[PDB]
Amino acid sequence: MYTYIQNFRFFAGTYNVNGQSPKECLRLWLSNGIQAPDVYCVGFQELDLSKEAFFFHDTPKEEEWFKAVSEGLHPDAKYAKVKLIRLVGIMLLLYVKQEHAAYISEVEAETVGTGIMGRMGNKGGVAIRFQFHNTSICVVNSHLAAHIEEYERRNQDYKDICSRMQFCQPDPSLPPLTISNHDVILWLGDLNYRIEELDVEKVKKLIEEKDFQMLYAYDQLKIQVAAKTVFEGFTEGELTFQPTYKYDTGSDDWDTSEKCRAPAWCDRILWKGKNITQLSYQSHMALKTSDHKPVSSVFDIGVRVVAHHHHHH
Ligand SMILES: O=P(O)(O)Oc1cc(-c2cc(OP(=O)(O)O)c(OP(=O)(O)O)c(OP(=O)(O)O)c2)cc(OP(=O)(O)O)c1OP(=O)(O)O
Numbered sequence: 001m002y003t004y005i006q007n008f009r010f011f012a013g014t015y016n017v018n019g020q021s022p023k024e025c026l027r028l029w030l031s032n033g034i035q036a037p038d039v040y041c042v043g044f045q046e047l048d049l050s051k052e053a054f055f056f057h058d059t060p061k062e063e064e065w066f067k068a069v070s071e072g073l074h075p076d077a078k079y080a081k082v083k084l085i086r087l088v089g090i091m092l093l094l095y096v097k098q099e100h101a102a103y104i105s106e107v108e109a110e111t112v113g114t115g116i117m118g119r120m121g122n123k124g125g126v127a128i129r130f131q132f133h134n135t136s137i138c139v140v141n142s143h144l145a146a147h148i149e150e151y152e153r154r155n156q157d158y159k160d161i162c163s164r165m166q167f168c169q170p171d172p173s174l175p176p177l178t179i180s181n182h183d184v185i186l187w188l189g190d191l192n193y194r195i196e197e198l199d200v201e202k203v204k205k206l207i208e209e210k211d212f213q214m215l216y217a218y219d220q221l222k223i224q225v226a227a228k229t230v231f232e233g234f235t236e237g238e239l240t241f242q243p244t245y246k247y248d249t250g251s252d253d254w255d256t257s258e259k260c261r262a263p264a265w266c267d268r269i270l271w272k273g274k275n276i277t278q279l280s281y282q283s284h285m286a287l288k289t290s291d292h293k294p295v296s297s298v299f300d301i302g303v304r305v306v307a308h309h310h311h312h313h
């Protein structure tokens with residue numbers, strides 16, 4: 001046989017749905033005029049805020065949002081469900097075009113709670129890793145700790161995900177698979193890093209003026225990554241969309257409750273590995289089901305394809 005690099009189109013999405021059932025068609029998120037992706041990696045947070053889901057019960061929110069997403073994928077291609085994984089309200093879905101189904105192997109999913117008592121599932125991460133052709137890929141969906149002052153807990157949450165997430169090994173004599181041990185890592189979710197120092201009315205005003213350079217200079221994720229305390233070697237595209245948190249339900253108004261929570265770029269998509277090229281990075285204002293807005297991104301990722309020759313002598 002022989003081998004070559006081929007670009008396939010990866011969509012990555014993250015959406016914190018605030019414990020709500022889907023009430024809106026998700027084509028605006030998943031298939032907004034773009035070309036049909038080869039792979040869909042769709043992640044959720046706060047799927048179900050009930051006591052029941054928190055204590056590991058099954059939730060109808062799962063099937064509800066799965067169908068919502070299935071129906072939302074690009075109508076020009078037939079998509080195969082590869083894998084679903086959920087811890088409490090953190091759910092990751094992996095689809096691929098039916099063409100590619102035969103070349104997906106070694107699918108493993110795992111979860112890690114980092115919430116109450118540092119081990120429950122109100123916060124944490126879930127991951128699906130797999131081999132597409134001869135490229136190892138791991139997709140991680142995490143919901144890190146809330147609130148401005150808890151940036152150091154968000155750091156630790158990231159650490160625990162990174163050290164506890166262990167995938168199964170076809171060869172038992174080798175060390176278990178960790179997230180790092182992959183050709184391609186996409187990390188998405190409500191990473192929940194807020195705006196430091198600046199006060200609430202400053203932020204909104206700075207957002208109203210669309211100066212996303214000055215606001216970004218005080219973004220906690222940037223800061224911490226700069227201090228090399230989290231996400232070493234990861235990259236993120238330029239943020240050309242306004243903060244994706246926190247809104248009033250059913251509108252584009254900033255949280256008007258008594259908490260009057262400041263805006264933030266809670267919901268992010270980061271990556272690491274070779275031959276990854278980000279084509280877009282967008283939020284989707286139209287969808288008003290949640291107090292967050294959903295965020296998408298499309299990559300051209302170069303996969304190592306091993307194939308058969310045609311008669312060529
Ligand atoms: O790359 P891999 O390792 O697979 O090896 C090869 C397979 C075929 C091949 C094998 C077939 O089936 P079978 O071998 O019977 O399983 C085919 O179906 P067919 O028998 O229906 O004709 C075929 O026809 P298409 O071109 O794919 O239609 C091509 C040709 C190759 O080039 P060449 O012929 O120039 O040597 C070749 O490279 P190599 O030179 O390295 O051997």
Ligand SMILES: [Cl-]
Pocket residue numbers: 082083084085
């Ligand atoms: Cl499944």
